[PDB]
Design an enzyme around this catalytic site. Structure first.
Site, PDB file in Angstrom:
ATOM      1  N   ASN B 168       0.788  -1.262   0.102  1.00  0.00           N
ATOM      2  CA  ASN B 168      -0.035   0.134   0.117  1.00  0.00           C
ATOM      3  C   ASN B 168       0.971   1.252   0.142  1.00  0.00           C
ATOM      4  O   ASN B 168       0.492   2.346   0.868  1.00  0.00           O
ATOM      5  CB  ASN B 168      -0.901   0.017   1.259  1.00  0.00           C
ATOM      6  N   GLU B 197      -7.092  -4.595 -14.347  1.00  0.00           N
ATOM      7  CA  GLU B 197      -7.466  -4.282 -15.768  1.00  0.00           C
ATOM      8  C   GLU B 197      -7.683  -2.954 -16.059  1.00  0.00           C
ATOM      9  O   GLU B 197      -8.072  -2.536 -17.195  1.00  0.00           O
ATOM     10  CB  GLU B 197      -8.740  -5.283 -16.235  1.00  0.00           C
TER      11      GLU B 197
HETATM   12 NA    NA Z   1      -5.918  -2.400 -18.452  1.00  0.00          NA
END
Ligand code: NA
Ligand code: 2X1
Ligand code: 2X1
Ligand code: CL
Ligand code: NA
Lengths: 213, 213
Positions: B168, B197
């Protein structure tokens, strides 16, 4: 008398024949000394290895080769039944790469094609009995990264889980390529930034995993 | 009812007992549905694994634990003779973490300490018979990352090659932690940015390899 020629030469004079590790060390040394590239083993090599090891690909396509460092790095980890195909437009770089693989004794793990990726990629299925790729390594010509990525898709060469790894992807470079794979839902992305011992990115790499169309 | 109580419950109701991978899959699947944390396996777990596999530590110290995902992730890869030590200041998180390792059957791989890192760290060599650490995983409380790092050095607990991995670490967060390890020659640094993604970073991790004083 090119830099990649003087690297070859240095390897041939100093590396242990048929010893990929020696060969990689000799390259890393000379370039670091020469300051053409600093600690390529830690900055780039280690990351390549981890990707190969996580995915254990049978078929890797290298697009772009400079002196053959990357091809040796990857080829040395490929198990029997696994192979590397390498493409590079510049004939000298292609040849140095071949000669570099020869010295390492890795020539039988690799197939070098000297030509334009735009012309060669579409021949892979037909000419080269490739259905799809497990891994692609984008190297050398950053301006070709995005076009290459798009053409691979077009040719039906990527499948779900095909791993792309592109080298020398450092902001503000390869702007168009990064934006695409990050924004695209067809790519699951991880960026690697190697700092070595200081604060400035020495090398940036992008891993982009194809998620299907 | 805390989130990490609710994660533990979900796991206990849904994961296969004594199955680490099942437990990791139960936490991810739940946090993702709750949109409390997206694809932690891809965003963070897979990186942790790559680091553990590269370095194969005998002794890992985890500083910070929320629900125990990380402890399970790391403990499942430790071979016989390797062990994890986990420190967490919040008593419920520590307990959730313990109960989470229980369900996964990994409790013998781990020792959990409830307390402040600043108080526990100096007792490690003395009270817990540690000489140095092979790996440190910094987790949960980012504000402690820099002072933890400094105390670990002060306490003589890092050796050349000790791998620190911090979760983090996403710019503009932890600016001093990052400037410290990158700025300092005592650390060789690599940043990992997981986008999954999407266009935007989901998780960021920093690997800093101790290089000595
Ligand atoms: Na992507
Ligand atoms: N897209 C690029 N970044 C790009 C495109 C094309 C090329 N071409 C060569 O290097 N040709 C070459 C190189 C060496 C020698 C000869 C002719 N014997 C030709 C390079 C880079
Ligand atoms: N530096 C920090 N980010 C920091 C420092 C301190 C703490 N303390 C607790 O969580 N205590 C706690 C939490 C739950 C219960 C009890 C005592 N029953 C104590 C957290 C974070
Ligand atoms: Cl190396
Ligand atoms: Na540094």
């Amino acid at each position: 008398d090119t830099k990649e020629q003087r690297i070859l030469r240095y390897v041939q004079q100093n590396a242990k024949p048929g010893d990929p590790q020696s060969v990689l060390e000799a390259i890393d040394t000379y370039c670091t000394q020469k300051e053409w590239a600093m600690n390529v083993g830690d900055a780039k090599g280690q990351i390549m290895d981890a990707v190969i090891r996580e995915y254990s690909p049978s078929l890797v396509l290298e697009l772009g080769a400079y002196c053959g460092y990357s091809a040796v790095r990857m080829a040395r980890l490929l198990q029997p039944g696994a192979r590397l195909l390498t493409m590079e437009i510049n004939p000298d770089c292609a040849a140095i790469t071949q000669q570099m693989l020869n010295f390492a004794g890795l020539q039988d793990k690799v197939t070098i094609l000297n030509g334009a990726s735009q012309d060669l990629i579409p021949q892979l299925k037909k000419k080269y009995d490739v259905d799809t790729l497990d891994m692609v390594f984008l190297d050398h010509w950053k301006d070709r990264y995005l076009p290459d990525t798009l053409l691979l898709e077009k040719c039906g060469l990527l499948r779900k889980g095909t791993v792309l790894l592109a080298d020398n992807v450092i902001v503000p470079g390869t702007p168009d390529f990064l934006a695409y794979v990050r924004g695209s839902s067809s790519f699951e992305c991880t960026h690697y930034s190697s700092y070595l011992e200081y604060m400035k990115v020495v090398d940036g790499l992008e891993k982009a995993i194809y998620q299907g169309p």
